[PDB]
Paper text:
Photosystem I (PSI) forms supercomplexes with light-harvesting complexes (LHCs) to perform oxygenic photosynthesis. Various light-harvesting antennas bind to the PSI and PSII cores and optimize the capture of solar energy and transfer of excitation energy to the photosystems in oxyphototrophs. In eukaryotes, PSI associates with a distinct set of LHC subunits (LHCIs) to form the PSI-LHCI supercomplex, whose three-dimensional (3D) architecture has been resolved in multiple species by cryo–electron microscopy (cryo-EM).
In this study, we determined the cryo-EM structure of PSI-LHCI from E. gracilis strain Z at a 2.82-Å resolution using single-particle analysis. Compared with the structures of PSI supercomplexes from land plants and green algae, the E. gracilis PSI lacks PsaG, PsaH, PsaI, PsaK, PsaL, PsaN, and PsaO. The PSI core of E. gracilis includes 89 Chls a, 17 β-carotenes (BCRs), 3 [4Fe-4S] clusters, 2 phylloquinone molecules, and 4 lipid molecules. Thus, the E. gracilis PSI-LHCI does not have the inner belt of LHCIs formed at the side of PsaF and PsaJ in most green-lineage organisms. LHCI-3 engages in unique pigment-pigment and pigment-protein interactions with PsaJ.
Author numbering:
A (entry chain B): 368 to 441
B (entry chain A): 11 to 751
C (entry chain F): 168 to 333
D (entry chain C): 2 to 81
E (entry chain D): 316 to 504
F (entry chain J): 1 to 37
G (entry chain B): 515 to 588
Amino acid sequence: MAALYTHHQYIAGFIMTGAFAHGAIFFIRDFDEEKNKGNVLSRILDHKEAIISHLSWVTLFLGFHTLGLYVHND
Amino acid sequence: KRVRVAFVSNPVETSFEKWSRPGHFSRLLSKGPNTTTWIWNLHADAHDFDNHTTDLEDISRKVFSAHFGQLAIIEIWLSGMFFHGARFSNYEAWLLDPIHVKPSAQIVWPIVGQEILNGDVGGNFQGIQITSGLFQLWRSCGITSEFQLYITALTGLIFSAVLFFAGWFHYHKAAPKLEWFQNVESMLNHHLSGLLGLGCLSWAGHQIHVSLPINKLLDSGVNPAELPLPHDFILDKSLISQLYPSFSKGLAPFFTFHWSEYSDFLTFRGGLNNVTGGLWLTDVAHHHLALAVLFILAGHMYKTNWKIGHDIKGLLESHTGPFTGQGHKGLYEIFTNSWHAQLSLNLAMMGSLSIIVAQHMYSMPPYPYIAIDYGTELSLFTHHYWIGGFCIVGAAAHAAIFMVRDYDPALNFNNLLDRVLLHRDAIISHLNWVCIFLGLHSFGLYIHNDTLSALGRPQDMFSDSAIQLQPVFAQWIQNTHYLAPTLTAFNLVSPTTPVWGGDVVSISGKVAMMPIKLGTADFLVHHIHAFTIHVTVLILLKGVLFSRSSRLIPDKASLGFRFPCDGPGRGGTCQVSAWDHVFLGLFWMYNSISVAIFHFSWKMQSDVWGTVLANKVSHITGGNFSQGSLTINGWLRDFLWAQSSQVIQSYGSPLSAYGLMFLGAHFVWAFSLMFLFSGRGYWQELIESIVWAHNKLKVAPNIQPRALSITQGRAVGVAHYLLGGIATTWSFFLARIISVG
Amino acid sequence: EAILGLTPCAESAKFQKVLTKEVKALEKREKLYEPGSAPFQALEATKAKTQARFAKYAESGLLCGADGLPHLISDPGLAVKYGHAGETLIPTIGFLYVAGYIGTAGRTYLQEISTRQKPTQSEIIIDVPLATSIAFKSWDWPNKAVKELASGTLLEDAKNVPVSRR
Amino acid sequence: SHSVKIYNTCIGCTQCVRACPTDVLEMVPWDGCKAGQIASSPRTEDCVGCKRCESACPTDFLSVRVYLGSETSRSMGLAY
Amino acid sequence: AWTVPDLADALKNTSAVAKAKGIATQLPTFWELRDALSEVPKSKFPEVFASYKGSTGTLLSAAEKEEKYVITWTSPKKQIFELPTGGAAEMEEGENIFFFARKEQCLALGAQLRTAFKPRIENFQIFRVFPNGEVQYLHPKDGVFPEKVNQGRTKANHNPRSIGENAEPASVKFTGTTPKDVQTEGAVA
Amino acid sequence: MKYFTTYLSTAPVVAVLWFTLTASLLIEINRFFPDIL
Amino acid sequence: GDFLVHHAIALGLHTTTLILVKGALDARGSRLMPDKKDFGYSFPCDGPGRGGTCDISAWDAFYLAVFWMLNTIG
Ligand code: CLA
Ligand code: CLA
Ligand code: CLA
Ligand code: CLA
Ligand code: CLA
Ligand SMILES: CC1=C(/C=C/C(C)=C/C=C/C(C)=C/C=C/C=C(C)/C=C/C=C(C)/C=C/C2=C(C)CCCC2(C)C)C(C)(C)CCC1
Ligand code: SF4
Ligand code: SF4
Ligand code: SF4
């Protein structure tokens, strides 16, 4: 039971990195902005700083508080 | 005449103006910040005096004055230790019962529950057990009161002020000229005869007149309250005559060269006192007095002002053989014009001295009752080993700074330094082979044992019960040192230490010292040590010899001592600088010292430290080093896993601070990998998105956020790695040896 | 009131077990010293504080688990309905007031010095009068926040914000 | 070999040319800027890829640009 | 005017070539040095040692089989300079010749000649030498140092746009070209 | 003293001072009113 | 105990996502290198200029994210 849970979650982890890797390779090799003008892909690219900054907030918030609470308890 | 004080009056005005202008010392930094990089550059460049000015006189002056500031901070630190010892310690209690009371000189305030750290250490006292050896050192000096500790701490604070004064004076008011600083023969004569010579004479004087009586009385159980005060030994000669009758003859034997009359306080017994487990103080007195004589003599060797004495430049130029070209010519100019060259040599020696101190102070315990304080013994060994490793790596740094900044080809044509640089591919390549050979034939033996053990073939292992590898030379040396008192050191009674052989010295039940025997396990660890030191030399020496050029980069010197790379071409040139060699050598020095202190801790706990019942000695880990250390699994299991029980079971006790420091250090170590494994390209692009959100809410800063530099990332990485590693071992060592022993 | 399967700490046996376990440890330590000595007094102060602390937790409606340790309720509805708002919900408001204050003071000082000749010199050498004035005038920071929000002076317009090739 | 290209934003400061350690770039005459010279890269078979030129360039997004490509013994900086 | 120089005219000076071969030789194997010392009395030991003059930083086997580089210049005085291959050497008054294994080492020494001497030396010429014996002159290629603009030079690899006006890679897919080499004037191989 | 206050106004001095006060205040509160959960 | 670890896992999922999303959204270019698409998915760096540019390619974002993914499945 332990082996099968571990096996499948490690495989899922590697596979989810790949999906994002091949997403980057699409944006470099196959995305053309002229053809995709005004649709959701170009829009998502046009507010990329909002996305990254908001994720940066969530990350900093969880990290601070969660490591905090563990260190308090220790 | 020639050697003379020469100076300049009032060369720099004392004002708080420049204190309010950060970066003043640099042409670039003084324009003010525009990015955050400036802030870091301000701290990184502050003590780099040879980048502020070009004048060697101005540099010498800054160096001399900074030295006084260092002495002032050291004096504050010592005064603190004496004060904490006088006002928050159980030193007077410990002086009555050294064996049972544990030394303690740090109390904690009650707040947020931290008072649990004030443990039960004895002497009607609660506090933190200290492992620095202060109490034993004080006892050896003859200090018995808190008043004496208080006086010392006040005098030291005044003395610290005076040294801060001297620094201001000798920089701002009366600054010596470069000619003064360049009197290296005067400096050597004074530092040998004066600082070390008279220093030893003075301290032998203190020993003979204060430390020897007071210790002699104390070792015969005389209760420190009813001890005479130290002057009483000077004023009343009858007191000191009862203890050492030779004093009744006064100084007449000295002047008539009948020195053998002083053979009751100036001995040559050898070995440890049977009461305290330390060296005999009468030996220590003879030692310091003999040193005095040799140092005063030695400082009479260089020529200053009187037509006698050796000229160093001559002496160096005289020694030149056939293999070596022009030989030692040109070195005198290097050692009297380059501060970085001197700092290199002096750090290499200071580092090597710290390691020798460590090895000599465990085997020949010099203070009363320090050998049966196992926490002290472990702490001092480990401390001095780390200090040594750091200094040696500094020596390599400053040597490379000398090659990049102060090497002149013109003045080094076909001397030793030039010839070294003409065969630097032969030096590095031979070092490379030796390192591979020692790697395979030493760590390969552990991998052998681990594998054959796991395959169920223990008779195929390198072991004392199997294929033996005996360290036969060291055994030979041990035997010779044990027999020495019978022929080759005839006038000595006992050998220098029990380590060489003989009987167990045991104070109360506890073992002070006992013979340390060597076999297969000792052979493998020793060759592991020889391997890790050789690799560290390989990384540091490569950095010094290839600091100016290499086949890859012909003009490295023009790029400098500290530069991140020369770009992604030629296959990629990351970390070619000499600074980057010091950075990688820090990790290998960490690996080397770490293995040595693990060796010590396991060997001492398994084969020396313990308790004696009649004649049977019950060691702390019951002799598991000889068999258990022959595999990696045994190091992990019988050392790392087993001896880590004390630190991980320390919560809720007065040792819980070690538990927290153990986890905290694991954290800081892992945090270091974020800096070591990444690069600033990623971070600068992530900071661009963060700067976006600040910009959108109109709260972006005028000093523009920049990711750290390449060099600084590497520096942060190795700093947090070294801190987290060393503190982890510190927690683990102190919690273990404070509990069990 | 027992909710979520938890017992109140005031009527939990495991809570008492914990208090006993701490007090017993302190007694063991006291055995080594003499009843009048100053270490003894220190251990008594420690024990007093300990018993006081458990008593406080008992009369606060804290809720104990099976471990016998108090547990906090963080859904605001459950907190307010069963009198546990002092565990997380009040601290929320308290943190968000102080964090808004610090932000407001920092933003204010930055917007003030940005109009100076060399604004970056006023970041490494703090204008201490200016900073104290801002620190004390910023106690009513929602005034400035809701004004800036509703007026439109909170956000820079997108045309004035540097951005990459997207 | 690496490929070094020069774009029309050059201002003819000669700094890239000075920086280059394998003599790949030179200044040729031009009329697109006040200095009346542009950089050029005739000898790109000798370029090692160090990117020293791009570090020297003072224009906002560089006018000289090194695109790393196929390795040769010359570009790999080998003395063997 | 200026004509392409010849290494042959430089290599006529047999002393300067001797020195160059002396300095671009590898240090001897220990065996060989032992044998040399074995054939002399003790008084003559430093003379044997003085007969070596090379280092370990000099040419290896590639120089013989691929290409080496030569720098020539003329010095006004006898002075010590620093080799780019580690160590020091003496330039003689008159013609100096030195062999190196990379062009970067040559130009490094050239850079030192133009900065670190009080009468600056500007007259160095660098040549590439093939095993067959062809000698290609390299630097300064047209007589004028490349930092100085010289008539007759043409634009090489010029792109007549800014860097933001390059195309997207996704627009030239399966066509055999990149955005960086579209419409490049003076495109070299 | 003529530029000593400007030195005290620099960022690391002001930081040390501010943290020291803020820390001291939290310590003194945790002396008077301990164990707030 | 379940509350703390679930917040740790959240920290790991968000932080892995942030590294990979930055990778994919800064793939074609950033301010530190506006022409990143011309160098491709994987390249070492753009040299020590402009303050230094180690690990600036999208491949490096993937490489960084794999440590975070192993930590999170861990
Ligand atoms: C269906 C799934 C799938 C498919 C069809 C592809 C296809 C491709 N990938 Mg993608 N990718 C995937 C999943 C997939 N990938 C996943 C799961 C990840 C996350 C790990 C990635 C991350 C990824 C990256 C980061 C990149 C690609 C690239 C590519 C392309 C070239 C790969 C190459 O050249 O391999 C040849 C590679 C090898 C032969 C190396 C093997 C390394 C081994 C497996 C390490 C294993 C360690 C050791 C051997 C273990 C042994 C046990 C030990 C005890 C001895 C190709 C189009 C690359 C590309 O070019 O796009 C530009 C690229 O850079 N992929
Ligand atoms: C234990 C190891 C460790 C830790 C603690 C971190 C922490 C972090 N990583 Mg790093 N990382 C690590 C290993 C680690 N990493 C490794 C091994 C790699 C692979 C190379 C990375 C690669 C990486 C990338 C690529 C990214 C991160 C990011 C982060 C940040 C995520 C924010 C957050 O979660 O909480 C908040 C912060 C913490 C929990 C740490 C702060 C520590 C304490 C809480 C601060 C208080 C200190 C205290 C006052 C004492 C001061 C010191 C004194 C001497 C003065 C955080 C700073 C990401 C990020 O920055 O997103 C914004 C990000 O993009 N990490
Ligand atoms: C007597 C000993 C000594 C002296 C006088 C010097 C003097 C100097 N060193 Mg050398 N060096 C030494 C020993 C010494 N070093 C040792 C032991 C090492 C190996 C670690 C080095 C390795 C070294 C390198 C690699 C470099 C120098 C450089 C320098 C120069 C500038 C230093 C500077 O500005 O930093 C200012 C000081 C700091 C930024 C402080 C750094 C704080 C460290 C990283 C952390 C300390 C941790 C602390 C102990 C505990 C934790 C603190 C807590 C808050 C958590 C200066 C000439 C630099 C140079 O290039 O000059 C040419 C340089 O690059 N040194
Ligand atoms: C465990 C981690 C690890 C290991 C195994 C190595 C191994 C090595 N390091 Mg690396 N290093 C490491 C971590 C490690 N390093 C880290 C963390 C850093 C800091 C960044 C470095 C930085 C570093 C530097 C800067 C240098 C090294 C060098 C070396 C080489 C030392 C020479 C040697 O001993 O080869 C012998 C090989 C070993 C001891 C590896 C194990 C081999 C096993 C036991 C044998 C394998 C089985 C084999 C098939 C059996 C054949 C015989 C049998 C049939 C009888 C060696 C390959 C140095 C070097 O290359 O100098 C020559 C060097 O200069 N390392
Ligand atoms: C005026 C100061 C100020 C203000 C109002 C903000 C506001 C913000 N920051 Mg920023 N930040 C600041 C300073 C400030 N920050 C500083 C000094 C740093 C360097 C450590 C950062 C580093 C930083 C990062 C890495 C991130 C933010 C983010 C954010 C946004 C979300 C909230 C947050 O993450 O807090 C977190 C705040 C910190 C981690 C920094 C602590 C700020 C201190 C405590 C207060 C200011 C100190 C200052 C010296 C006060 C002097 C005032 C005095 C002279 C009057 C929010 C817009 C996040 C974001 O982008 O959201 C979308 C984000 O990822 N900030
Ligand atoms: C709860 C629940 C439910 C519902 C559900 C839901 C709502 C779900 C959702 C889900 C989801 C919602 C999911 C998601 C996920 C996601 C992801 C996982 C993503 C990822 C992505 C990626 C990675 C991508 C990439 C890319 C790029 C980057 C670029 C371009 C291209 C592409 C797109 C490829 C029900 C009612 C039934 C029942 C009850 C419970
Ligand atoms: S990358 Fe280096 S070798 Fe190539 S052109 Fe630029 S400076 Fe010259
Ligand atoms: S490419 Fe840049 S560095 Fe070279 S001349 Fe033009 S502007 Fe100057
Ligand atoms: S910029 Fe970074 S990755 Fe590139 S060569 Fe320099 S050190 Fe290496």
